[PDB]
Symmetry: C4
Subunit: 364 residues, 4 copies
């Protein structure tokens, strides 16, 4: 039944109209300044970067999506085996379903069988931490895929509108997380899920020892829309209310600025509606260390292995194009390349007290 | 004939295109910052608040609308009995028609028969104060429904365009109001009716001892539009002139900022185009103490009791969703949650000398 | 043939699509703050104001349009006799045609026969001043209609695109104007003709003794569009070039600000796209002493006397509505009522060094 | 085969939808202030200006386009003979094709046979400097047309997406350029090709001794779009990636401000989407010394000699119209005429640290 929600999520995300529905990343408000004389050759561009203790080929990761059933495991297999080939890290979806059901385990474990070298990121939800999960469940999630890190997701907006949702975000959960992190052999990443991380949330998490963030801002997969659709489907009246919240959240670009600014030493994944290598380049230039993608990887993987390989080729070419055209020889150079911030994003930053001058210093 | 206007008002408001016609609340310019870690559970959210000497369940009121005839009284009865059930305060429509016609009284009195505990708010127009109404008429309006307060409405824009309108707003009326307030057993609220309260008007009313305001800004029911339609109907040439004023007024959001800023200790209802619990949450976060609704309550009540009950359930769920997602455990926390002000509202505030820093301190 | 241009002008302005074509007044960027308690009664509003040595009923004038042929004279007659009835001043069109042709004189003179008391404003073009017109021509224009003032029009944009146009605006013309003003028994108003007066032009004219200005900004009658159409008609290739300049000029609202700011003691007509009494009210609140109108008076006059009477009633009602709703008892109060400046007009003012604070002081 | 790309470029530029495709010049954000009293006569307007050691009739140049084959040479012939007649300078297209193929030479040389007096500008691409071109190749390009200057183009964005592209922009190329300039008898202009010059690129080039720039910003011919179309045509998957970059680059207007500000003594060509004499006037008022045009000259030349003559008449009239209407008697006066900067251009400048006050001083 949790396994049912799992297939339904994939089905709605993949096949319904939920990508950027009534929402925005604000990334149109970010412009990378063109350099007519780049000072480099396309072929000397170096996209390698660090991901904790490993080196990755490209400053992009696939963020967590699925698992919990055979056909979900075969999607995970395709994603893992292509991510392995391209040298890019992969998060799996929530492993709750596999803590609850032993039959669901193989759909996660397959990932490490087929991807022995890339970083693999485990996944559990924050509500489970308030509902009995602790050290041993985290260790199980980690060992199940020989994870290099664990992502703990924030999805209170999704939980609020989800028919069987669990909107339990008591502070006790952070106390528990902080304790768990003491004993864990791998780092914790705290990621949102379509609604973004603000400076108040980032500072709170940091105060409990969290140093690794994944923005997952509005403007990509709309998880309120997905649950709205699940509510429409089962005649649940929360559907009409969900519609009022479709543009709820911190836009990806605003979230990147907010996290980088409020916690300048954070290791930061910029994700939520990254759809091209240009999006990826903007997210990095703005302040992220790596760009995250989920939905377009799902849709490609469903079409097949070769389709997903072509997808990654395209993303990597686009990223390098944006590095070439900004004179950025490597990832560090891109992080400090010249940008323009305009429009609503500029107004957002101004109101939120993000001094642009100190901002520019911090992102460089 | 006044009773005729009363039915015509309800009919045009309920069934014609007058809601936000060529007007705007500016509430799109207000964004509540999403908190990925709320620090609370949905079920611990407390929406109780004070309304003068009573406690109400939810920081929302139904503002005054109707009365004056049987079928208008049956609408009032539906509204009152549902408002009683939900623990929310209800204003009635103008009681002038019931001061003028004894047959109209029951259509107001029914309200207190069916709603013994909730705050009930009386209603008289400012133009009547200029035209001979005094203490006794106020006392009659109050006792008629055992009111906990009286609303005195400002509708000069409506009166200007109304075929039988009375645009008499001499300053003498305020001297009279101040005198009446000395002797009244319940507080006075001064409310607008679709065109909003500016700082000049708020400060003027305050200088005369008015401490309780209801913004009723532009962006919701368009009363100039209603009278334009009444003019079109009777071939009155004022109709074409009304069309030029459809976007006349202070937008609800700007009016909330203006009243809170210029009279920081005011008890403030934010109303005019509040259509969801998210609107309600924005209005409160901006500076209102409670959100007011009229038109969508009318339209639901016309459909029936159960329809109105479902409407309030939806509003309350949406409000609590916005409280959850900003980490607001109670109404006081919502009043000081993090916001972003963008666009035309920001430009409005800047021109009007609303220092945003002192504004943030004042709204808390 | 000049008489032909006169007929063609009226015909294109009245019946073709040239009103606000690809242009804007910026008046949407000006908002009059609504006062829910005006402090006045509609019937005590006083709209009287000064126009040089005469009193006028309403702070509105009909600006110069036509004359030069019988049917143009009958239009002038209708305008004059209604303007006389309403106590509002009337400018006539360019009297060049009547200096050049004795048969054209009656079409101007009729105006004073039918309107003995209102201010009547003569009209000559600046290019005529560079081409031989002097004191006597001015005196003839004045005595022809017993004028209370003379308007000298600036139309370089129109002259550039006009098939038989005369774009001669040598500085010598100003020396001449200054000399002529020494000897003239009535004041000179310098007016534009759809393209507006900037601060550089206003200060220049002031340095030569001009104190009376009529903005005639872009956003109403588009004179470049009129000449474009005349060019299209006669296969003149200047038509395609005119199209590139359709949005050329200082917007009416910007021009009012610019003239009031740069020449604070000016007597100022705000005109160019004034289409309602609300437009008129905004223009005066912004800084004008009176609002000017041409095109909509033309279109009404063509329909007839009664049609023009209804038009003025509508304008006057709308003005008084805007005065009522801002608590403006008289024209002086309107000149200092509260406004909001937003959008492009705000950006225009900022770039042009119009300090908003000193601006508010100067207009009040 | 390079000859083939040459024909294909002309064909796609002339006949496909690539002019301002998903791009913008930002020139709508620049407004020349209208002067109702110009202080001059149309006929006294002087448009003559300096182009290195020659005088040209009009502050406009045809920037480099084509050559390399007979039919391309006949286009160059038409352009050269009309440019000669109008006294305006002409750049030729890349002469690489003529260094590589002796048969291609006549298609460039024809230009000087038919245009003996106007400035003629040679052309070579920056990638060729990293690939073996040096002094002698420059001298050959120059002598081939008795050039008065050489343009070295920057096209890294084009090279990235070009099927046979050469995205080699190593810094060594500037070292070489600086050396070559020591020994060359004519000055070097560095020009972009539809994606614009930033302050970082301008300052870099300046640090290597480059004093003459041609902005070629986005908003006109979209070279990424041209290569996208060439990619679509040959089934190259880079096509989908090109689509993501269609709005990549510095908008012409922004580039003019950036180069003028960062290198205040530069000799500056403002080009990229200059389509009218009004565009030309804005570019000069903004900070350019001359306006450049390519695409609309190509399209006219393809129609014929008389068509191109009419095109230049139209451009010249529009320029003089804009000078008339700003009171600009000559090109120096236009360079310091009053402007307003609004919108995205204003935001661009602000973020990039272009102080508008020091900007106004520098451009005047
Ligand atoms: C079908 C699907 C399932 C997902 N499930 C999870 C989950 O189990 N755990 C998690 O942390 N994020 C999950 N996500 C959220 C993504 O990891 C990501 O944060 C979000 O979708 C925004 O990125 P995108 O716009 O590139 O999809 C899911 C995404 C998709 C499309
Ligand atoms: C049919 C109807 C009649 C109304 N009559 C009154 C009135 O008698 N007195 C009053 O103060 N306001 C009256 N109102 C104005 C409302 O109380 C409220 O201020 C305004 O409609 C804006 O709120 P809304 O957009 O939620 O309707 C009326 C509203 C409606 C829809
Ligand atoms: C048909 C017509 C002819 C006009 N001719 C004259 C003219 O002779 N002299 C003059 O000063 N302005 C003349 N005007 C310009 C107007 O006085 C006015 O400045 C301009 O039309 C802007 O006002 P509007 O938008 O209300 O028309 C003419 C206007 C119209 C509609
Ligand atoms: C068909 C065509 C070919 C071009 N080839 C050249 C080239 O060989 N060298 C060069 O420097 N620029 C070349 N350009 C770029 C233009 O000179 C100019 O910088 C750019 O097109 C922007 O101006 P526009 O928008 O007026 O076309 C070419 C332009 C066109 C339309
Ligand atoms: C986006 C995302 C977190 C989707 C998973 O949400 P979920 O609440 O269904 O996950 P759980 O299985 O952990 O409850
Ligand atoms: C919005 C609102 C005040 C509608 C009632 O206006 P009205 O002038 O019809 O009310 P009265 O019966 O008090 O005159
Ligand atoms: C708007 C306006 C001045 C129209 C009259 O322009 P015109 O050049 O036709 O007038 P003249 O008869 O004075 O030349
Ligand atoms: C715009 C422009 C420079 C077009 C010419 O680019 P190209 O790379 O084809 O020129 P080359 O022949 O110099 O390579
Ligand atoms: Mg969950
Ligand atoms: Mg009334
Ligand atoms: Mg003329
Ligand atoms: Mg090349």
């Amino acid at each position: 039944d949790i396994v049912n929600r799992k297939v339904e999520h994939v089905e709605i995300a993949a096949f319904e109209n939920v990508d950027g529905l009534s929402s925005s990343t604000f990334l149109n408000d970010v412009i990378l300044v063109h350099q007519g004389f780049p000072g480099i050759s396309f072929s000397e561009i170096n996209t390698k970067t660090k991901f904790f203790r490993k080196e990755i080929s490209v400053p992009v990761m696939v963020t967590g999506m699925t698992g919990g059933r055979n056909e979900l495991g075969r999607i995970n297999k395709i994603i893992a085996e292509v991510a392995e080939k391209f040298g890019i890290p992969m998060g799996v979806g929530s492993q709750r379903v596999a803590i609850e059901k032993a039959e669901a385990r193989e759909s996660f474990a397959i990932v490490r069988k087929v991807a022995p070298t890339i970083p693999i990121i485990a996944n559990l939800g924050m509500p489970q931490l308030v509902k009995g999960y602790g050290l041993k469940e985290f260790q199980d999630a980690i060992q199940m895929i020989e994870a290099d890190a664990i992502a703990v997701h924030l999805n209170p907006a999704q939980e609020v509108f989800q028919p069987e949702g669990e909107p339990e975000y008591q502070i006790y959960a952070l106390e528990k997380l902080r304790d768990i992190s003491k004993e864990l052999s791998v780092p914790i990443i705290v990621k949102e899920s379509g609604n973004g991380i603000s400076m108040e949330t980032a500072k709170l998490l940091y105060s409990y020892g969290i140093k690794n963030f994944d923005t997952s801002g509005q403007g990509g997969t709309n998880w309120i829309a997905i649950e709205m659709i699940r509510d429409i489907r089962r005649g649940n009246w929360k559907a009409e209310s969900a519609k009022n919240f479709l543009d709820w959240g911190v836009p990806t670009a605003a979230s990147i600025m907010e996290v980088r600014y409020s916690v300048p030493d954070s290791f930061l994944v910029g994700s939520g509606g990254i759809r091209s290598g240009l999006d990826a380049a903007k997210a990095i230039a703005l302040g992220a260390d790596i760009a995250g993608m989920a939905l377009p990887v799902l849709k490609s993987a469903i079409e097949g292995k070769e389709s997903l390989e072509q997808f990654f080729r395209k993303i990597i070419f686009e990223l390098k194009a944006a590095m070439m055209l900004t004179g950025s020889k490597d990832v560090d150079a891109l992080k400090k390349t010249s940008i323009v911030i305009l429009g609503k994003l500029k107004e957002w930053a101004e109101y939120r007290g993000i001094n642009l001058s100190i901002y520019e210093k911090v992102r460089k």
